[PDB]
Design an enzyme around this catalytic site. Structure first.
Site, PDB file in Angstrom:
ATOM      1  N   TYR A  83      -3.860 -10.887  12.433  1.00 21.36           N
ATOM      2  CA  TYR A  83      -4.859 -10.159  11.680  1.00 21.36           C
ATOM      3  C   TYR A  83      -5.819 -11.115  10.979  1.00 21.36           C
ATOM      4  O   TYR A  83      -5.790 -11.255   9.746  1.00 21.36           O
ATOM      5  CB  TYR A  83      -4.146  -9.294  10.647  1.00 21.36           C
ATOM      6  N   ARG A  88     -13.798  -9.515   9.822  1.00 25.11           N
ATOM      7  CA  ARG A  88     -12.692  -8.557   9.906  1.00 25.11           C
ATOM      8  C   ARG A  88     -13.049  -7.248   9.214  1.00 25.11           C
ATOM      9  O   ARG A  88     -13.753  -7.241   8.189  1.00 25.11           O
ATOM     10  CB  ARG A  88     -11.483  -9.170   9.210  1.00 25.11           C
ATOM     11  N   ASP A  89     -12.510  -6.148   9.734  1.00 30.41           N
ATOM     12  CA  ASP A  89     -12.653  -4.836   9.084  1.00 30.41           C
ATOM     13  C   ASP A  89     -14.121  -4.463   8.924  1.00 30.41           C
ATOM     14  O   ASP A  89     -14.582  -4.132   7.826  1.00 30.41           O
ATOM     15  CB  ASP A  89     -11.902  -4.802   7.752  1.00 30.41           C
ATOM     16  N   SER A  95     -13.810  -6.601   2.652  1.00 31.77           N
ATOM     17  CA  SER A  95     -12.841  -7.242   3.538  1.00 31.77           C
ATOM     18  C   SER A  95     -12.339  -8.532   2.929  1.00 31.77           C
ATOM     19  O   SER A  95     -13.113  -9.303   2.365  1.00 31.77           O
ATOM     20  CB  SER A  95     -13.364  -7.581   4.952  1.00 31.77           C
ATOM     21  N   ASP A 135      -7.309  -2.482  12.922  1.00 29.99           N
ATOM     22  CA  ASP A 135      -8.647  -2.199  12.405  1.00 29.99           C
ATOM     23  C   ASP A 135      -9.713  -3.066  13.079  1.00 29.99           C
ATOM     24  O   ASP A 135     -10.645  -3.526  12.422  1.00 29.99           O
ATOM     25  CB  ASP A 135      -8.710  -2.366  10.881  1.00 29.99           C
ATOM     26  N   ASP A 313      -2.493  -1.740  -0.877  1.00 32.81           N
ATOM     27  CA  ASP A 313      -3.576  -1.649   0.097  1.00 32.81           C
ATOM     28  C   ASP A 313      -4.925  -2.095  -0.456  1.00 32.81           C
ATOM     29  O   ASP A 313      -5.853  -2.326   0.323  1.00 32.81           O
ATOM     30  CB  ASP A 313      -3.748  -0.185   0.538  1.00 32.81           C
TER      31      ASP A 313
END
Length: 358
Positions: A83, A88-89, A95, A135, A313
Site C-alpha cells: 500500500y 495514493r488514494d 492522503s 483504494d 481510519d
C-alpha cells in the site's frame, strides 16, 4: 479452485498487532472483557507495508516465521498488504502516502517493490500472501472525473504491473484490491471492472500467482446479509457474496479462474451507517467472522481480517493537516486520533459488539 494458498499452512500472527492488543487489554477494567480482548492477539491479521520504513520489519517477520516453522514442524504463511502507490488514494480528501508522481513517484515505488522482493527471496520456506494496493484500481472504474485520479491512471497501472510481475518471480500469492459491493458491485460497474482487472492480469503475463481479488478491505459490508442494509437500496448486490457471485463469472469468461478473499474484521454489526459511502471509524462496529477457509462459496478462498480493528481510519480533528472530513460525520466515532494510531475506545466496542462473540 484446486490450490487454496492457505491449505496446509499455519498463519504467522502479527507481533505488532499482538503488542497493540496486549497493551489495549490491560486498559480494559472489566476483567472478563479484558480476557476476551486479550484473545484477539491470536486471530490472524494482515500487516500493512504502507511506507518504505516498514520494509525492515517485514524481514524480521519472515525470519521469525521461518524459525517458528522449524521449531514446530509446520509451514508458515505471512499475510501482507502492499500500500504505497504514488499519489495514493487519488479520490480521497487527504492522503498519507509518502510518494508523489511529480517527485519521481514511479521510480520510488519500484525501489519499494525491489526492497520487498529482496526480503522475500531470503526466506523461500515461508509462504507470502499479499493484498495489492487497496483504494487504487477501483478508482479507475468510477472516479476518472476526479482530476487527481485521471492524472494518476497510467502510473497506477504501471506500478501495479511492476508489483505483480516482480512479486510473481518470488512466488507470492496475490489478490488485487477490488473495492466492495457498494463500489464496484453496482450492476453497471461490473463489466468495466472485469475488463480492467482482466487487462491488468494479461499485462502481467497471466501468472498463476495472481490468484484473484480482495473485497471489503477496511470496510464493513456483510459477506451474507440476512436482510439488506437500508443503505444499499437500488443495488441488488447488497452484500459481498452477491458482488462476488456476479463478478466471478465475468472473469472466468475471459480465461481467468479467479478466486477471492473477503475482509470481515469489522463486519459483525450491520445497519450502522447512514450512507454506504461512509467509511471512517464507523460507530458501533463489531469484530466479524473470524478468518477461515470454510467460506461456503466456490469462489472464496478465505474470510480474512485485512484491516486491523482498533487502528484508526482517520482523525476527527479539523485542525490536523491529515484531516479528512469523512471522519467528522455523525456515524463516525469521535473524537478520533490520527490514521493508523491506536483508538482504544473503538477497540473496546469492537470486542463488546463482536458477532459471533469472542
Amino acid at each position: 479452485s484446486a490450490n487454496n494458498p492457505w491449505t496446509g499452512f499455519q498463519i504467522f500472527l502479527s507481533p505488532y498487532y499482538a503488542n497493540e492488543v496486549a497493551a489495549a487489554a490491560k486498559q480494559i477494567t472489566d476483567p472478563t472483557l479484558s480476557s476476551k480482548a486479550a484473545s484477539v492477539a491470536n486471530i490472524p491479521t494482515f500487516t500493512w507495508l504502507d511506507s518504505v520504513a516498514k520494509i525492515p520489519d517485514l524481514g524480521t517477520y519472515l525470519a521469525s516465521a521461518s524459525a517458528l516453522g522449524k521449531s514446530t514442524g509446520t509451514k508458515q504463511l505471512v499475510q501482507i498488504v502492499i500500500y504505497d502507490l504514488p499519489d495514493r488514494d487519488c479520490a480521497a480528501k487527504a492522503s498519507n502516502g509518502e510518494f508523489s508522481i511529480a517527485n519521481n513517484g514511479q521510480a520510488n515505488y519500484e525501489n519499494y517493490i525491489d526492497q520487498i522482493v529482496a526480503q522475500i527471496q531470503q526466506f523461500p520456506d515461508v509462504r507470502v500472501v499479499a493484498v495489492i494496493e487497496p483504494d487504487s484500481l477501483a478508482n479507475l472504474v468510477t472516479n476518472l472525473n476526479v482530476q487527481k485520479c485521471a492524472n494518476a491512471k497510467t502510473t497506477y497501472l504501471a506500478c501495479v504491473n511492476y508489483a505483480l510481475t516482480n512479486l510473481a518471480k518470488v512466488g507470492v500469492y496475490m489478490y488485487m484490491d477490488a473495492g466492495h459491493a457498494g463500489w464496484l458491485g453496482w450492476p453497471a460497474n461490473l463489466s468495466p471492472a472485469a475488463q480492467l482487472f482482466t487487462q491488468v492480469w494479461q499485462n502481467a503475463g497471466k501468472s498463476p500467482f495472481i490468484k484473484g481479488l480482495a473485497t471489503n478491505v477496511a470496510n464493513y459490508n456483510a459477506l451474507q446479509a440476512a436482510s439488506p442494509d437500508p443503505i444499499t437500496q437500488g443495488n441488488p448486490n447488497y452484500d459481498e457474496i452477491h458482488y462476488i457471485n456476479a463478478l466471478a463469472p465475468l472473469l472466468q469468461q475471459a480465461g481467468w479462474d479467479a478466486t477471492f478473499i473477503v475482509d470481515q474484521g469489522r463486519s459483525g454489526v450491520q445497519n450502522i451507517r447512514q450512507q454506504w459511502g461512509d467509511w471512517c471509524n464507523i460507530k458501533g462496529a463489531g469484530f466479524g467472522t473470524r478468518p477461515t477457509t470454510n467460506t461456503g462459496s466456490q469462489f472464496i478462498d478465505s474470510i480474512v481480517w485485512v484491516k486491523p480493528g482498533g487502528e484508526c481510519d482517520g482523525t476527527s480533528n479539523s485542525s490536523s493537516p491529515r484531516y479528512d472530513s469523512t471522519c467528522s460525520l455523525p456515524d463516525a466515532a469521535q473524537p478520533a486520533p490520527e490514521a493508523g494510531t491506536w483508538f482504544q475506545a473503538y477497540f473496546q466496542t469492537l470486542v463488546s459488539a463482536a458477532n459471533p462473540p469472542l
